[PDB]
Write a protein that binds this ligand. Structure first.
Ligand code: DWH
Ligand code: ZN
Length: 257
């Protein structure tokens, strides 16, 4: 029953998911002047050359591009992470207007959208077990701003017509997520949570400093998706972001000076 509307949105989630008011909730505002450089943080290792995308799904909250995570084919390692984390899916959060849409903010600045590449720690065997652990997931967050087109995003944009409504999926093979990355892998990192129910506190967040640029046409196509199912009254899938939550007893660390 949860969603992003007036009557079921982020301010309501705590009633079904009390952890919404927990000690390590996400997203957060990244105060760039207060984040501390940690010279011991290793470079990120993003190894996506053998990635196998399978399917794209409108789940009624966003759309997920899903990967074969039954082998170490696309993995994230290094940075703040111990061990190997396997890519299971990516998705986005976006706004109704270019001035909002991201979940994380940077010195209170909101971006037009935010990409989340979701990975789970292989020491826990599968995603369902991983989300029950404090170090179960690593989500790589990348901001989107509107300007020039991102060529590597276009194959995603062009399949969206086929998954307009909740519960629709389409084959989506041979998609290379490397085409969604910015040049720099400089990042901030902190311990947090899933930003949708069940809001589990299982995520090491790694948020890249450098945004990617996407075109106005590309983000306009995100905004044509529907939260509703086929045959139901049309509700545009926009503003599917949770606002910044209290940092509480956490320090955001930076990989860069
Ligand atoms: C209906 O139940 C489910 O879908 C549970 N299975 C499942 N599978 C994936 Cl790939 N992600 C998720 N949840 C999920 C993953 C990532 C995030 S986010 N926005 O913190 O990156 C928020 C929610 N659940
Ligand atoms: Zn997300």
């Amino acid at each position: 029953h949860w969603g992003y509307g007036k009557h079921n949105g982020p301010e309501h989630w705590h009633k079904d998911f009390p952890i919404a008011k927990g000690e390590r909730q996400s997203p957060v505002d990244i105060d760039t002047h207060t984040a501390k450089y940690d010279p011991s943080l290793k470079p990120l290792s993003v190894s996506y050359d053998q990635a196998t995308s399978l399917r794209i799904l409108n789940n009624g909250h966003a759309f997920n591009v899903e990967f074969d995570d039954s082998q170490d084919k696309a993995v994230l390692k290094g940075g703040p992470l111990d061990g190997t984390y396997r890519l299971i899916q990516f998705h986005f959060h976006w706004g109704s207007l270019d001035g909002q849409g991201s979940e994380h903010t940077v010195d209170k600045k909101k971006y037009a959208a935010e990409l989340h590449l979701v990975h789970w720690n292989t020491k826990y065997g599968d995603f369902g077990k991983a989300v029950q652990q404090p170090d179960g997931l690593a989500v790589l967050g990348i901001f989107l701003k509107v300007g020039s087109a991102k060529p590597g995003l276009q194959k995603v944009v062009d399949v969206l017509d086929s998954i307009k409504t909740k519960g629709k999926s389409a084959d989506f093979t041979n998609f290379d997520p490397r085409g969604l990355l910015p040049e720099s892998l400089d990042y901030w990192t902190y311990p947090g949570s899933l930003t949708t129910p069940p809001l589990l506190e299982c995520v090491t967040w790694i948020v890249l400093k450098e945004p990617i640029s996407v075109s106005s046409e590309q983000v306009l196509k995100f905004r044509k998706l529907n939260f509703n199912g086929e045959g139901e009254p049309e509700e545009l899938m926009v503003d599917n972001w949770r606002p910044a939550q209290p940092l509480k007893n956490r320090q955001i660390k930076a990989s860069f000076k």
